[PDB]
Nucleic acid binder design. Structure first.
Ligand SMILES: [Mg+2]
Ligand SMILES: [Mg+2]
Ligand SMILES: [Mg+2]
Ligand SMILES: [Mg+2]
Ligand SMILES: [Mg+2]
Ligand SMILES: [Mg+2]
Ligand SMILES: [Mg+2]
Ligand SMILES: [Mg+2]
Ligand SMILES: [Mg+2]
Ligand SMILES: [Mg+2]
Ligand SMILES: [Mg+2]
Ligand SMILES: [Mg+2]
Ligand SMILES: [Mg+2]
Ligand SMILES: [Mg+2]
Ligand SMILES: [Mg+2]
Ligand SMILES: [Mg+2]
Ligand SMILES: [Mg+2]
Ligand SMILES: [Mg+2]
Ligand SMILES: [Mg+2]
Ligand SMILES: [Mg+2]
Ligand SMILES: [Mg+2]
Ligand SMILES: [Mg+2]
Ligand SMILES: [Mg+2]
Ligand SMILES: [Mg+2]
Ligand SMILES: [Mg+2]
Ligand SMILES: [Mg+2]
Ligand SMILES: [Mg+2]
Ligand SMILES: [Mg+2]
Ligand SMILES: [Mg+2]
Ligand SMILES: [Mg+2]
Ligand SMILES: [Mg+2]
Ligand SMILES: [Mg+2]
Ligand SMILES: [Mg+2]
Ligand SMILES: [Mg+2]
Ligand SMILES: [Mg+2]
Ligand SMILES: [Mg+2]
Ligand SMILES: [Mg+2]
Ligand SMILES: [Mg+2]
Ligand SMILES: [Mg+2]
Ligand SMILES: [Mg+2]
Ligand SMILES: [Mg+2]
Ligand SMILES: [Mg+2]
Ligand SMILES: [Mg+2]
Ligand SMILES: [Mg+2]
Ligand SMILES: [Mg+2]
Lengths: 48, 30, 77, 181, 100, 138, 176
RNA sequence: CGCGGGGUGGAGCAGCCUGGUAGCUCGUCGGGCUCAUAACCCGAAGGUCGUCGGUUCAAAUCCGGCCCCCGCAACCA
RNA sequence: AAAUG
RNA sequence: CUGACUGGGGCCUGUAGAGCACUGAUAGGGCUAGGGGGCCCACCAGCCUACCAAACCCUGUCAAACUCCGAAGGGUCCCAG
RNA sequence: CGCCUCCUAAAAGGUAACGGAGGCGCCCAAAGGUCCCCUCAGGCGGGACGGAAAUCCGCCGGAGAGCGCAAGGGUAGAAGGGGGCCUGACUGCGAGGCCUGCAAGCCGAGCAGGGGCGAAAGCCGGGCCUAGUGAACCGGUGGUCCCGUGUGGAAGGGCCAU
RNA sequence: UCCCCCGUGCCCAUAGCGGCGUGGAACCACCCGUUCCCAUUCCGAACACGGAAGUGAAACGCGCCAGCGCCGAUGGUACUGGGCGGGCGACCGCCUGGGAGAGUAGGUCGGUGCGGGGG
């Protein structure tokens, strides 16, 4: 949806992604979590 | 903490609660 | 001019391996919506409530009164 | 505090009677006190930022037990506030908190209640327990007229291991509960 | 129409339960083997006399069940106790390679 | 006029009227009954007329017992339309009846009158009927 | 892109680059030809209308011009700002697209045709309360309302007196 | 027989998609201005929202069945 | 400016 | 040699039938909110009613999208022909 | 006109009609993991403001409550409610099956890496489950270093991701 | 082995609701405390710890009673696989194999394995 929206996750300065789905309006205004990158292992992860 | 019930109808009551400085303007006297 | 004429592509549910049949680890034994049947011995079930063998063996259907119905798998002894 | 004026009275002035009265066999078996509850509906978690904690620090100011903030279980259009959080305040009294409370209530509280001509004798009924309401909250000592922006009634429910009303009745009666008789 | 549900057990999938019981004065514990409905190893609290702490008493009956166990083939089990609440009374006993 | 006040569904299928009579084959409420000899669908339209010529014959008298009730919808596509486009509209209700069912039974009225009133009620029904008494029903 | 056979008054759509809203719709199928949809429309901003006809096929292109309720906050430049008392967003509507922007009030609740988060029509209510801050205590005299606009009123209506004014005729419709 | 829209204070219309808000004009009754009546000025009352169901925490509003309503079609033979 | 009986 | 078909076992099912335990439908009767009416001042309750009528209670029935039940059969695996 | 649910559908599966009756094109950063706790709707009392269910107390109440939305199956020995930490809404894989004309769709134990919760047993590769969808082509964004028209390098592609 | 009790599982209401009665030596519980581990959206109610004066009143175990609940034939029907007839339909009947559901007679206030404690 619109208020919904698609999005992925970047390893913090670099590549890789997860691509989940934020949700605008409700808990939004940016968002990051911990997840494992094809390279090395586990880190934060921001949107974009 | 313990307390004191100082009515007016005489009769004082020694018990417990908070602040033993009680002016019970009317105990059991009616 | 109607307001109907719809339905959903059948899904083909139910027991798909009956008591006394030999299976292999993996065989989904039951397809069902609720939990008409419940996991048993060497019988894990999936997300959709799909019971499936956990080891090569036979299938047994234990009826547990008000405790529900079970499908176990007594491996080949 | 493990003991109070009323607690004793119960043990060495009520305990005897009831037995002699209904003639109980086993020690336990005779009416004791389980717990006395005191809640408030308030229903005032409406607009203007319904703090109404004052009523919580107070409810407990006269009890000595911070109350438990209950909430609405369903949700009602009819009278605003719905679904959750909103209103609800209530504390459960047991043991010694139970005694050091009922005392005042029975000695200083009930006394000054506008008219109060005893406590309506029907509020038992089948209940090996009793229930009664209060309009004000200043009926208590630990709180004065000045400090209390608004009024605040409340319900007081005493639970008893009594099975009958007579059993319940007598007890609360030998304890000191006045009665509209 | 049922006080406490328990069934922390029921969630027993891995054979050999270390079924515990919290009696007001003592503590019993048996190593039950369902799918057979037989108890393979016991070792009770005051049903062996033993000390007078309660918890330190548990510790004992623990080591007592382990030692006994081991010498039977046991060495791998799964804890339990209904309202186990896994606290105070805990018998984090040595031996018995059941870990935890 | 005698049709369910509510229903979970408006249009219902047709089914088939075999034998038997799930139940209601003995009196139970009166002195003389009106068992049905052959299968049919009795229309509320009818039942009424049977209950009516009944009261009317023995004007101001005993009471009547209507042990059948029109609850099955009856469809009928509009007049002069071709086949298709859905199941027609509803036009009243039927009451399924199989040989044996006791549609009517009265009492409080003499036996001389009963035989006549019910005899009439029958000329208002699409099926064959037979009037019964009251005995080995208990 | 919705066709026509599927229109209904109220349906809003984009025609000739402009915004409309079918207000009259009548399926027409005479003779054995193909069916036809004959409607009448209204621009969303201007009032302009225009009855038209379409075949059975022809698709139109539905629009999403929902009408939330905004709220005046303050003037600025040759514009005035509102807010959707719902999501509290901020809309800077150009004086033109605010019907009767005058005779309004910095704090009154009105209506706007949200088309992609930008009102193209901001109407107040047919009559609103306003404090006349003008007029000679002298009958049918002019009275400057708190919003600077002027209106014709009776006598008794004097400085400070809050009145009502039909926001369509800017005529005195009584006092507060 | 279908096609779409409509039943809201006494009349004529808003409000219905975007459920919590009854908006307007005339009319009515009260009171003033007049000798009086209009007009005009002041103030007030009035709506089961067509009904019967359902959905919702709540419905004029969303959902279905009916009842009346208005307009459109019925062609090739 | 301003109708009628 | 496994076939169609058959024998013996094991499992899966919710139809015919029947049955009201749920979903609703439902004739009369009971008991009984609720309205309608009369007794009567408003002291606001008290009572009666060959009426409209919830719950529940029996007595009677109905159902594709109801089922406390439930066949005959049907499906499949196994061993045999 | 595609998708889900129920009936028709004749007790495996499947099965038609301009047959009966309803839903969907979404949604949740908690409505997801895990660990620990709690049990409902209603009904009769009993109670200050309080309808007829606001909050409280007592019994009686196995499920009629709830489970975001249709219906169905399911379920209180939780799938429901509450709280603490968390993000397995993992990446490399995927034995073995369901369904099946193809294409798709669905379940999935176990291994590796690296984590979350738990004392541990274990559990986690979204959501009680069945809808919430769109082959290729053509392009766009990151990544990657694979090709790079004599050489080096670019141009432009490729692979992964979206 | 034999009973009494405590654990646990199995069959899955013939195991239940309701009455009535019992047991405290041991067990088990309520109970007595809340300093400590751990605690309650406020309550040691519940979880948790230390204890044992008292009680078996609660709760539980064990008896008994059958009002309710649940279990429930044998007969006979319904329906039906396969075979075969009837009417114009309507639907009805015959044979051979299977055979309900209600209802009646009656039945049950549990049976039971393993390990512990006890005479
Ligand atoms: Mg079709
Ligand atoms: Mg079809
Ligand atoms: Mg189909
Ligand atoms: Mg289907
Ligand atoms: Mg007919
Ligand atoms: Mg035609
Ligand atoms: Mg006979
Ligand atoms: Mg006037
Ligand atoms: Mg052969
Ligand atoms: Mg049938
Ligand atoms: Mg059926
Ligand atoms: Mg079949
Ligand atoms: Mg077979
Ligand atoms: Mg062979
Ligand atoms: Mg398809
Ligand atoms: Mg079927
Ligand atoms: Mg089938
Ligand atoms: Mg309740
Ligand atoms: Mg009440
Ligand atoms: Mg209230
Ligand atoms: Mg109340
Ligand atoms: Mg209620
Ligand atoms: Mg959590
Ligand atoms: Mg794979
Ligand atoms: Mg494979
Ligand atoms: Mg394929
Ligand atoms: Mg989902
Ligand atoms: Mg969840
Ligand atoms: Mg192409
Ligand atoms: Mg490309
Ligand atoms: Mg690119
Ligand atoms: Mg190169
Ligand atoms: Mg070249
Ligand atoms: Mg070159
Ligand atoms: Mg080159
Ligand atoms: Mg170079
Ligand atoms: Mg590239
Ligand atoms: Mg005794
Ligand atoms: Mg200490
Ligand atoms: Mg602590
Ligand atoms: Mg006892
Ligand atoms: Mg029977
Ligand atoms: Mg028989
Ligand atoms: Mg035959
Ligand atoms: Mg039988």
């Amino acid at each position: 949806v619109r208020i919904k929206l698609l999005l992925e996750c970047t390893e913090c300065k670099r590549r890789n992604y997860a691509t989940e789905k934020n949700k605008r309006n409700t808990p939004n205004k940016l968002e990051l979590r911990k997840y494992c990158p094809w390279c090395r292992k586990h880190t934060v992860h921001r949107e974009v | 903490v313990p307390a004191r019930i100082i009515c007016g109808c005489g009769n004082v009551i020694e018990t417990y609660s908070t602040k033993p400085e009680i002016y019970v303007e009317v105990c059991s006297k009616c | 001019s109607t307001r109907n004429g719809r339905d959903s592509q059948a899904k083909r549910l139910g027991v798909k391996r009956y008591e006394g049949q030999v299976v292999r680890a993996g065989n989904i034994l039951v397809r069902q919506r609720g939990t008409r049947f419940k996991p048993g011995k060497n019988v894990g079930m999936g997300r959709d409530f799909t019971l499936f063998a956990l080891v090569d063996g036979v299938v047994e259907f234990q009826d547990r009164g008000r405790l529900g119905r079970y499908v176990h798998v007594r491996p080949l002894a | 505090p493990l003991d109070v004026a009323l607690k004793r009275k119960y043990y060495e002035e009520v305990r005897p009677e009831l037995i002699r009265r209904f003639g109980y066999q086993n020690v336990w078996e005779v009416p004791r006190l389980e717990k006395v509850v005191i809640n408030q509906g308030l229903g005032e978690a409406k607009e203007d930022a319904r703090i109404l904690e004052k009523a919580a620090q107070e409810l407990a100011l006269i009890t000595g037990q911070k109350p438990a903030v209950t909430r609405a279980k369903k949700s009602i259009s009819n009278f605003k506030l719905r679904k959750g959080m909103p209103i609800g305040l209530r504390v459960t009294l047991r043991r010694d908190r139970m005694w050091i409370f009922l005392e005042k209530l029975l000695n200083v509280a009930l006394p000054r209640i506008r008219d109060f001509r005893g406590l309506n004798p029907n509020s038992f009924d089948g209940r090996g327990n009793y229930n009664l309401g209060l309009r004000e909250q200043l009926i208590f000592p630990e709180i004065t007229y000045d400090m209390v922006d608004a009024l605040r009634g409340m319900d007081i429910a005493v639970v008893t291991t009594a099975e009958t009303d007579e059993e319940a009745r007598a007890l609360l009666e030998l304890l000191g509960f006045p009665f509209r008789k | 129409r049922r006080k406490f549900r328990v069934r922390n057990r029921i969630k027993r999938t891995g054979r050999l339960r270390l079924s515990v019981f919290r009696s007001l004065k003592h503590i019993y514990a048996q190593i039950i083997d369902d799918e057979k409905g037989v108890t393979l190893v016991s070792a009770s609290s005051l049903a062996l006399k033993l000390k007078g702490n309660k918890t330190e008493v548990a510790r004992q009956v623990g080591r007592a069940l382990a030692e006994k166990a081991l010498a039977l083939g046991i060495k791998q089990v799964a804890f339990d106790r209904g309202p186990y609440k896994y606290h105070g009374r805990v018998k984090a006993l040595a031996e018995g390679a059941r870990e935890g | 006029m005698l049709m369910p006040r509510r229903m979970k569904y408006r249009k219902q299928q047709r089914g088939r009227l075999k034998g038997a009579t799930k139940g209601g084959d003995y009196v139970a409420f009166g002195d003389y009954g009106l068992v049905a000899l052959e299968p049919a669908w009795i229309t509320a339209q009818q039942i009424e007329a049977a209950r009516v010529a009944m009261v009317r014959h023995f004007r101001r008298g005993g009471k009547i017992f209507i042990r059948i009730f029109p609850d099955k919808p009856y469809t009928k596509k509009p007049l002069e339309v071709r086949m298709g486009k859905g199941k027609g509209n509803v036009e009243g209700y039927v009451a399924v009846v199989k040989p044996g069912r006791v549609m009517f039974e009265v009492a409080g009225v003499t036996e001389e009158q009963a035989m006549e009133a019910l005899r009439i009620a029958g000329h208002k029904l699409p099926i064959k009927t037979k009037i019964v008494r009251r005995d080995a029903y208990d | 892109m919705i066709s026509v056979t599927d229109l209904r008054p109220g349906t809003k759509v984009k025609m000739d680059g402009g915004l409309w809203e079918c207000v009259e719709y009548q399926h027409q199928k005479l003779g054995r030809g193909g069916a036809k949809v004959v409607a009448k429309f209204k621009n969303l901003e201007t009032g302009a209308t225009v009855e038209r006809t379409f075949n059975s096929g022809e698709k139109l292109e539905d629009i999403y011009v929902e009408t939330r309720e905004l709220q005046y906050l303050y003037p600025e430049g040759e514009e005035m700002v509102f807010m959707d008392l719902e999501t509290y967003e901020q809309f800077a509507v150009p004086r033109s697209r605010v019907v009767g922007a005058e005779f309004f009030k910095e704090g009154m609740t009105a209506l706007g045709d949200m088309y992609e988060g930008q009102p193209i029509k901001v109407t107040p209510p047919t009559v609103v309360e306003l404090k006349v801050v003008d007029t000679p205590p002298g009958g049918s005299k002019p009275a400057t309302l708190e919003t600077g606009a002027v209106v014709q009123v009776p006598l008794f209506v004097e400085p400070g007196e809050v009145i009502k004014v039909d926001t369509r005729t800017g005529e005195y419709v009584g006092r507060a």
